[PDB]
A paper describes a structure:
In this study, we determined the crystal structures of E. coli (S)-ureidoglycolate dehydrogenase AllD, which forms oxalurate in the presence of NAD+. This structure represents a metabolic branch point enzyme during (S)-ureidoglycolate utilization, which is the end product of purine catabolism common to plants, as well as some bacteria and fungi. (S)-Ureidoglycolate dehydrogenase AllD belongs to one of eight clades of l-sulfolactate dehydrogenase-like superfamily. The dimeric structure observed in the asymmetric unit represents the functional unit of AllD, consistent with size-exclusion chromatography, in which AllD eluted as a dimer.
In the monomer, AllD has 10 α-helices and 13 β-strands, which fold into three distinct domains. Domain I contains N- and C-terminal regions and consists of a four-helix bundle (α1, α2, α3, and α10), two antiparallel short β-strands (β1 and β13), and helix α9. Domain II is the central folding unit, with seven β-strands (β2–β3–β4–β12–β5–β8–β9 in order) and four α-helices (α4, α5, α7, and α8). Domain III is made up of loops, one helix (α6), and two short β-strands. Overall, Domains I and III, which protrude from Domain II and face each other, are localized on opposite sides of the central β-sheet in Domain II, and these domain orientations generate the inter-domain interface on the top of the central β-sheet surrounded by Domains I and III. First, conformational differences were investigated between two subunits of AllD in the apo form. This analysis resulted in a root-mean-square deviation (rmsd) of 0.45 Å for 315 corresponding Cα atoms, and these differences were evenly distributed throughout the structure, indicating that the structure of subunit A and B are essentially identical. The apo structure differed from both the binary and ternary complex by rmsd values of 0.54 Å for 337 Cα atoms. Although the rmsd values between the apo form and the two complexes were not significant, large differences are localized only in Domain III. Structural homology searches using the program DALI with subunit A of AllD in its apo form as a search model indicated nine structures in this family, with Z scores of 36–54 and rmsd values of 0.7–2.7 Å for Cα atoms.
Numbering used by the authors:
A (entry chain A): 1 to 337
B (entry chain B): 3 to 317
Amino acid sequence: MKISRETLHQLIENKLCQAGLKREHAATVAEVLVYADARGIHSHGAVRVEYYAERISKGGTNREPEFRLEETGPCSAILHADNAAGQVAAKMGMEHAIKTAQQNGVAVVGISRMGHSGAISYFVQQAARAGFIGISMCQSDPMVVPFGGAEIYYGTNPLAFAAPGEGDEILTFDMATTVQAWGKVLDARSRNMSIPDTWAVDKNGVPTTDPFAVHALLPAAGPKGYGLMMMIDVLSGVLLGLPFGRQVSSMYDDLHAGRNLGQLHIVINPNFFSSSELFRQHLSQTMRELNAITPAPGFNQVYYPGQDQDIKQRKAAVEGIEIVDDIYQYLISDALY
Amino acid sequence: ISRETLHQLIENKLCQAGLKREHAATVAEVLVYADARGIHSHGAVRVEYYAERISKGGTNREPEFRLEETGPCSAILHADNAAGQVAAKMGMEHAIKTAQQNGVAVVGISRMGHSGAISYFVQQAARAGFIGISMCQSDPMVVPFGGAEIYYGTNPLAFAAPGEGDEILTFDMATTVQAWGKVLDARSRNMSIPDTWAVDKNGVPTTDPFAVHALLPAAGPKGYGLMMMIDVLSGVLLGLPFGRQVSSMYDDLHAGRNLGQLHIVINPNFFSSSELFRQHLSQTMRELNAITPAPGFNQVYYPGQDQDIKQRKAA
């Protein structure tokens, strides 16, 4: 299937407002989801709306959250999110991060107790359009073995980064700290496809090619992805006084209960270090020079990080967002779950 | 051979090579730290390279340090191409001081030599009760994912956080699969190398270390984005040479390296209870080490644990 950005937004906003979210909250949630789809990050796209709807109606996601922005220092704050939708809480936090970095050069803001926030690179792009460097990270559903391990501990804790170049240019990098996303496993379950042995592991911690055998995911680059997801958990969970590692709520544990997730934003105003105009020129030069690199045999081109997603996002404004078929059929009707 | 022994030795040699005693001790300290943890890539195998560079003026023996505070939580240490160990340590001290008072600190080290095992600097912060993050630019040596030309270096990243009592969690990683000192190592071994480490002039993975032109990024585009990020944060942000422009170790022992490093320090009290934080950090380390190992493994380590142990028993 294929529809435009604006229609898909409308549909998602409708389905979510119908579940019981306020109008503007559903708009924000929708905004973050279509962003993901437009960039080809479909696991954080419209596919999640049905799940979101059920949790909203059962009161797992708060539809009347009492936000409280606690400012703890000149460059630090916690947004107590009262288990609001994650897309909403995270963006609000980023907006406070932005104005703080604007005034005082740097900002570190935790988002305390929120639902799933979607593709977190949305929030760092926010910092970048304001002319700042953005870094963001959050906890996730426990699904990954430690390096050398056979029991679940951390989630697929994502990390994203963005910085501005000249004009509208933005360099956006995001990464999962696992080899692959859980959805790719359920999709090969939904195929009787057999998966690569580098993705995942059975209940004994032995890597497997049987998606039905899969109990947990492997961390990217062994101990490295392991350390990175540890760091993200410490920074967006332990730092905020939230449940951590093993303790983090799983997706389908209790649809009537808040996730209590944590997210951390870090924003840096380049003006507080050197010329922001030269910074932006150097970002734009980086992107050009990397894209001009002689590709290895096999490769058509070298991308600068996130470039392929930027290209997809741009091809999407012209041609429309690609979307797996039935999600569309769900979106129009009157049924939530 | 004791710890105060190599230190006093290296302190001596480097002070002979040109450095202030205060500077020689600090460089010694950091080289001493690294060997203990089995980070031989940065241990005292490097004293003579350093000594040469010091004597030849390619490291500033009389740096005009300038700490410019740019905001309540930001600063640049203008390092005048001083030894990186000295510069990085100094900026960390200011970053710790700043986080302690205002809760957060982002401090750039502008124009310094190689700083060594950068995990040393985040441990400083953790010892002070804070979270520490550090990262820096490196000698260009790595192809971009899909690339046949060099752009970024093995730009490392480090992170430490305090536990209960004297426990510290310390994690560091190179953004490449392997370091250059296993490639030159494999030529003196004369020994084939895994095809995961490096490529030839055409960017084709190679088993022949004499045919290595460039290293590969860890996890392809992921380590690639990470070394980019580190370059932007520790170089572009500071208005320093970046990417391909970054200087190499061996180009010119008379020339300042002009590297950058970035420190980020966070005071847990500005977010939650430090007591609970440290308790939970210690819990994490315990729980992870107690996880059932996968076959092939004798244990699960919390990140850095094996090095933490080495610098107990090497002492």
